[PDB]
Subunit: 564 residues, 2 copies
């Protein structure tokens, strides 16, 4: 509830919140002071006689440091300076409310992005890209406006309490008498309304998750969709969620419209009813009706905006927060990797008693055993679907094992040191995403540029012929996902991606699948003649690539075994 | 600027907008009549002496229908019914406002997504996926709330004009005084705030664009990012743009808080300055001291809200509108497709004179010639990157030739019939995206489920062993993009995709590169004994796939020439 919120906000944001609360109560005081100092300055106008009666207003004349005219100047300069001060302080306080609410987007977005980027590769494997995007994009933004709404609610409730006391001071009767009436009005405005808004907020978050998923997947299949001609079906399924989302939004905004209107109608009708009941029988009279009706209308007119603000802010905390702040609570309590150990690999790499399965699946391995000395260059062959890429995703730093250990020079590879060991692997993942930028990027993956190293890596992946006759050269852009390229070009850029990384273990996993037999020959011949200081792992369903692999292993419905 | 806005809105909600202008004029009328009618209703309080003077008010006392005390009761029921009526009128108006303003999300969004789904496949190729995701949820939302802002600007300038019209009648000189005063204050407010807001809104749009892409692409390379360890420099790239975006919104909100503050402060100041200007040298004796302060303050207290409204609303139209209203105008003028004619393919598929390069690039073909008789089953082979997939993308629906024709049974394939033509393609891509749902869907790709057909297609892609020993079998979900599978399982599913579609041209383009020699034998053997009624096109770097093909062509820097 609020505990979820105070978990989301860091140990510095809570401090900002308490600071804004104190600033809020103070600004409440100052605005009460403004609306209260309206009256005395207003009264010393057509009738200066108020300087001759009232005990608290007649003591000022006795000073006689000024005659009778010169009182209003000492009143006026102070009044206008206090109002200048009011305007400036309110500007500052509103700018702070901004700095807090709209800055929560930055405060929380990158936090959720970190929590996502840091989870285990398989923990991410069971996640959903579109929901991630919906979190860091839309949900944190609703959370930010929700922060602003909760904050504005707190400031306005403090204003309400201070006005409540100030109205209790003078004519306690009407003040307490009206407090219960307006509170009951709020009770029926909330009880009758709030379920609507909660249901609509649930509707809207669900619809948003939906149309995020639908946009993402159908764009990711655009070509097949254009072949199958069913663009209109995708569009129809999108129209579904868009109508749902928009309908919830319109119900929310119209709800948020109704409380001001209700307060207006009910308060005006009860004012006219009370005066209609007073025309015949009146509990106050002469100078008594003036006071009661005037202080009454002023207090009511000042109060109603605050109360509308209160109700609308709580309903907003129901619309977003409820169906949405949960979506962040559940996202910052996630299994995150850790640690910082370094590891050395100068002899061998034993597997030992592995055994593995996915978070709720049957085992693929069950105490298999294997060991790769530095520079061995082994290769796993099997039938499609038995568990090769899984085993290798296990040998490298992803996928913690279920029984075994994996040892790097007889040293267990665990969370404590898996970072520095991951730093050793160049992958080439068989199906490869290239982010739309330069061919220089992707290859480097952002990490510096060694011009001659990059040209070495370009030549080694026999890309030299491809970049040389592009117009912009190495700087040529690649298209989204690598769509502006061919297949073999995409995979050569992945091979070179990994070669730039430096070696110390070089996985393959169908790295030459999109190349012919001949380009693959060239690439394997340029690679083998450099992979004789590091070890490497070759996964290829087609032969020829494994011609220079020394030991050839083969998985089965049981553990793997050697083969020559 | 507004022409854009009326392009985005259809010939319906354009007329709905005219309707809402009318209704906002009416609500303005009733809203001003409310306060105006409260004034002659408060006039009959402590001193009942106004029923005997003023020419317009004494013409009803001696109607003699009722004594004089029984007048206030009829006036009172008038007031109660009118005020509940005003409540209901405002309810309906604010509902229509929310429904139109927050309702534009649905219609506009599905229109943009329709546009993007309907562009030529190459025209799509030169688009970024993330920009599309943003211009379909982030910028549509950013257009909806500010459609609301445009509405409010129109309604409030209309009510301000009618309110000035009333002030012109009742008390003329201070009317012009306040008019000059507050229009000049609004003007300085606008000319000082609006550049800040334009700059900020440009910054917010730019941040948001850069800020979606990091999310998209790094989520798409997650595996590599965790392997290279660089899983927070990514987070740093995000932190930059999230901070920029948040600061932008900070400036927006803190600015929009300034007009209201400046207006209320300066208004209290003009009240006090006019009364202190009045005390010593007064332009009115005995009369007008109250008649010109009461109505003047009571109407300034209503002009200030609508003035702040107009100012901050125009400023919203600066912040968001410039940023994404332009994006939308731009994303609605875009090349769509067309077509409706039918194509019958019972003999040959001539290509003839086929020239093509990508929209700005050098040519890849230049009048190659081919003619695939029905059922021929040919196959393309070339070196990685010479463009066989481009030729295939031309021979199926997408991709329009620069000079060629492509003739189906001696009928020109063009955008009058390409729809029905594409209907005949079973694709199978190089890289397979399986959206994350049932293994039945993907294979079906939505089009219902015909049991025997699904199972026969499963068994043809030898996936039957897989979905047998699977827990939920043909129902087990596939994971994001097919992540929860193997590459070969993904590929055989895509084979099942193209099989389930019915035949009539069966493209492959390395449909078996992720499968072993034996399972590829199995798949091709299953296919060739069913593809002897339809035609097909294999693109395979590895041999053996092309064993049973009839004619095998080869692509070069020039055209393609047969090979046997
Ligand atoms: N989506 C695209 N947009 C623009 N240009 C492209 C695109 N795809 C390919 N090209 C150009 O066409 C040439 C080869 O493209 P492809 O048709 O992918 O090659 P391919 O030989 O069919 O695929 P491979 O290498 O055999 S798996 C390249 O030089 C590119 O410049
Ligand atoms: N990310 C994942 N999440 C859940 N299950 C998975 C995942 N990856 C693989 N599996 C399962 O584990 C088995 C082995 O997966 P892979 O390692 O992809 O097989 P493979 O031997 O690499 O396949 P190929 O075609 O030879 S690359 C498959 O049957 C999958 O059902
Ligand atoms: Mg290709």
């Amino acid at each position: 509830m609020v505990k979820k919120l105070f978990f989301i906000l860091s140990k510095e944001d809570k401090n900002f919140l308490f600071f804004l609360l104190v600033f809020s109560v103070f600004v409440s005081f100052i605005e009460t002071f403004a609306i209260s100092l309206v009256m005395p300055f207003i009264t010393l106008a057509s009738d200066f006689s108020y300087f001759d009666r009232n005990k608290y207003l007649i003591s000022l004349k006795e000073y006689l440091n000024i005659p009778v005219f010169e009182i209003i100047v000492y009143f006026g300069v102070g009044l206008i300076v206090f109002y200048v001060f009011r305007a400036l302080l309110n500007a500052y306080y509103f700018h702070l409310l901004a700095r807090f609410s709209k800055g929560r987007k930055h405060a929380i977005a990158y936090k959720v992005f970190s929590k996502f980027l840091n989870i285990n590769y398989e923990k991410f494997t069971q996640k959903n890209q579109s929901e991630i995007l919906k979190s860091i994009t839309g949900e944190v933004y609703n959370l930010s406006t929700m922060i602003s709404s909760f904050l504005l609610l707190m400031s306005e409730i403090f204003v309400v309490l201070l006005l409540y006391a100030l109205m209790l001071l003078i004519n306690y009767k009407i003040t307490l008498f009206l407090s219960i009436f307006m509170v009951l009005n709020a009770f029926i405005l909330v009880k009758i309304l709030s379920p609507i808004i909660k249901k609509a907020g649930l509707r809207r978050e669900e619809a948003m998750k939906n149309f995020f998923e639908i946009l993402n997947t159908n764009l990711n299949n655009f070509k097949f969709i254009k072949l199958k001609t069913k663009e209109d079906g995708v569009l129809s399924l999108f129209k579904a969620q868009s109508e749902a989302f928009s309908k919830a939004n319109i119900t929310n905004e119209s709800v948020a419209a109704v409380p001001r209107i209700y307060l207006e109608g009910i308060g005006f009708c009860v004012l006219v009813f009370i005066v209609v009941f007073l025309v015949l029988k009146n509990e106050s009279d002469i100078s008594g009706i003036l006071s009661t009706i005037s202080i009454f209308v002023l207090a009511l007119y000042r109060l109603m905006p605050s109360a509308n603000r209160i109700i609308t802010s709580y309903h907003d905390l129901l619309y977003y927060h409820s169906s949405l702040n949960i979506i962040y609570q559940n996202l910052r309590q996630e299994e995150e990797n850790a640690a910082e150990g370094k590891l050395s690999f100068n002899q061998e790499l034993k597997i030992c008693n592995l055994s593995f399965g996915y978070e709720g699946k049957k085992y693929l391995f069950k105490n298999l055993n294997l060991n790769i000395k530095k520079g061995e260059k082994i290769a796993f062959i099997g039938e499609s679907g038995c568990g090769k890429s899984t085993l290798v995703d296990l040998i490298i730093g992803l996928l913690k094992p279920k029984e075994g250990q994996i040892l790097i020079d007889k040293q267990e590879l665990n969370a404590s040191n898996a970072k520095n060991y991951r730093q050793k692997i160049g992958y080439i993942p068989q199906n490869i995403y290239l982010f739309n930028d330069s061919i220089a990027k992707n290859i480097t993956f952002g990490d510096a540029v060694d011009e001659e190293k990059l040209n070495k890596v370009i030549k080694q992946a026999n890309l030299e012929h491809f970049i040389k006759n592009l117009p912009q050269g190495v700087q040529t852009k690649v298209g989204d996902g690598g769509s502006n390229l061919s297949g073999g070009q995409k995979q050569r850029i992945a091979i070179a991606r990994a070669l730039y990384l430096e070696p110390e273990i070089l996985v393959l996993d169908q790295a030459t699948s999109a190349l012919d037999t001949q380009s693959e020959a060239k690439i394997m011949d340029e690679i083998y003649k450099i992979s004789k200081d590091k070890t490497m792992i070759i996964i290829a369903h087609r032969l020829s690539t494994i011609t220079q692999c020394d030991k050839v292993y083969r998985l089965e419905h049981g553990k793997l075994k050697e083969e020559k």
